[PDB]
Write a protein that binds this ligand. Structure first.
Ligand SMILES: O=C(O)[C@H]1O[C@H](O[C@@H]2[C@H](O)[C@@H](O)[C@@H](O[C@@H]3[C@H](O)[C@@H](O)[C@@H](O[C@@H]4[C@H](O)[C@@H](O)[C@@H](O[C@@H]5[C@H](O)[C@@H](O)[C@@H](O[C@@H]6[C@H](O)[C@@H](O)[C@@H](O)O[C@@H]6C(=O)O)O[C@@H]5C(=O)O)O[C@@H]4C(=O)O)O[C@@H]3C(=O)O)O[C@@H]2C(=O)O)[C@H](O)[C@@H](O)[C@H]1O
Ligand SMILES: [Co+2]
Length: 399
């Protein structure tokens, strides 16, 4: 079968659990579409009620920052009449505003401005849908796919530069405040039975090094690459190439969201993370199988310096098997970051710079996470992960 019609293999990660992930493979003839611009994409997706099996082939580059006639839209097209960058910055300067949350005229105008862009760039993917790139050059630029539904497959697409023209200042985020944006490439918000495979995720032409710092902090126009929230469950992400981007994948968005416990069952395998700073993934609560992924970066890079690969968050149940990390000078301990409530990590076969290590033990964590994945394909020896993943991961590697 072609990529439009294949389904997730019955053993291929948590996505294969229960009813599995077949997307739109059974689409009838009038529910197969080929799309090459936002209008055609939006028409094919339709609304939440469009749950019949459907297959959507993306042909070429689809820019999501465009109007209904496909004219490109930028900052001045989205700006609320009352929003102004220089006045926003003057209003919320910690020097005069202090550390309270921004509120009042400019913040309200900024919020409305951001909703103006969201209406163009964010689209929901309805149940029983397969979306795949045709050829080696299918691209989604500036878009944020959101998946709240069940049974969805996304493959062979290069997602670039989910860019927010209106980052919000938050003085209380982190030790010194941070600017925050809204758009991921893909957000799984309660979505279930999802396969993301052979896609590429990067920051396109606007990497973070082209953004200035305001109040000493990077004016961050990006957010995540593939994030999962709000009881998202039964998901396989395989053979994806994440590169040149700060925060990759947060699974479980909040310590208070205890309803995520027993959910966020996600398998990550054969993904490549190059020049990714952090959160690859950062997990709360979930049983997440992480195996045969390759991570490569430098702690001294000026653009996207490595901070950590796996985030051991509250009650996370990461099961790591035969992953390979190549970051010169990094210690075994610093391959991961442990956050409050994170106490356990199964860690087997990890190579760091060519040497076998145990990040879990080095961080004092419990060596068992109370589960063993049954749904997986073949396990590569760690010695072969780098080569297999560089050769095979990302869009345009099949076609
Ligand atoms: O269908 C819709 O479209 C839908 O849209 C709305 O709802 C969405 C969403 O579905 C809701 O659940 C909710 O989302 C809430 C929030 O608005 C959203 O941005 C989000 O984000 C998470 C956290 O809330 C963020 O603060 C943030 O946090 C991360 C870390 O998790 C956090 O620990 C911290 O990290 C620290 C330091 O601060 C950092 O500096 C760094 O060093 O690391 C450490 C660390 O890792 O611990 O801050 C970071 C960060 O800044 O990114 O990001 C989280 C994330 O997953 O991105 O989740 C919120 C929530 O779960 O409540 O609201 C959304 C919204 O759009 O408003 C509509 O409201 C709804 O009607 C619906 O229609
Ligand atoms: Co996100």
């Amino acid at each position: 079968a072609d990529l439009g019609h294949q389904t997730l293999g019955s053993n291929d990660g948590w996505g294969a659990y229960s009813t599995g992930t077949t997307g739109g493979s059974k689409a009838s003839s009038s529910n197969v579409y080929t799309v090459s611009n936002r209008n055609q994409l939006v028409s094919a997706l339709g609304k939440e009620t469009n749950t019949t099996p459907k297959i959507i082939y993306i042909k070429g580059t689809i820019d999501m920052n465009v109007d209904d006639n496909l004219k490109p839209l930028g900052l001045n097209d989205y700006k609320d009449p009352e929003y102004d960058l220089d006045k926003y910055l003057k209003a919320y300067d910690p020097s005069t505003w202090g550390k309270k949350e921004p509120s009042g005229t400019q913040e309200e105008a900024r919020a409305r401005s951001q909703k103006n862009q969201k209406a163009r760039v964010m689209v929901d993917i309805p149940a029983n849908t397969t979306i795949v790139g045709s050829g080696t050059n299918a691209k989604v630029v500036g878009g944020n796919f959101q998946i709240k539904s069940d049974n969805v497959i996304i493959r062979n697409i290069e997602f670039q530069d989910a860019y927010d023209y209106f980052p919000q200042w938050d003085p209380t985020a982190g030790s010194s405040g941070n600017w925050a944006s809204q758009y991921d490439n893909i957000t799984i918000n309660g979505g279930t039975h999802i396969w993301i495979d052979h896609c590429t995720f990067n920051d396109g032409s606007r990497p973070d090094s082209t953004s200035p710092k305001y109040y000493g902090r990077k004016y961050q126009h990006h957010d995540g690459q593939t994030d999962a929230s709000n009881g998202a469950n039964y998901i396989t992400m395989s053979y994806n190439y994440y590169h040149d981007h700060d925060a990759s994948s947060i699974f479980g968005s909040s310590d208070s969201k205890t309803s995520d416990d027993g959910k966020l069952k996600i398998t990550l395998h054969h993904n490549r993370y190059k020049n990714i700073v952090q959160r690859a993934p950062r997990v709360r609560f979930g049983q997440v199988h992480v195996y045969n992924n390759y991570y490569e970066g430098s702690t001294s890079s000026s653009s996207y310096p490595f901070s950590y690969a796996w985030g051991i968050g509250k009650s996370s149940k990461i099961y790591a098997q035969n992953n390979v990390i190549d970051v010169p000078g990094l210690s075994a301990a610093k391959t991961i970051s442990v956050f409050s409530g994170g106490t356990a990590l199964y860690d087997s076969g990890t190579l760091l710079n060519g040497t076998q290590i145990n990040a879990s033990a080095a961080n004092g964590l419990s060596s068992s996470v109370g589960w063993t994945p049954s749904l997986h394909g073949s396990i590569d020896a760690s010695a072969n992960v780098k080569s297999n993943v560089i050769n095979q991961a990302g869009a345009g590697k099949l076609n």
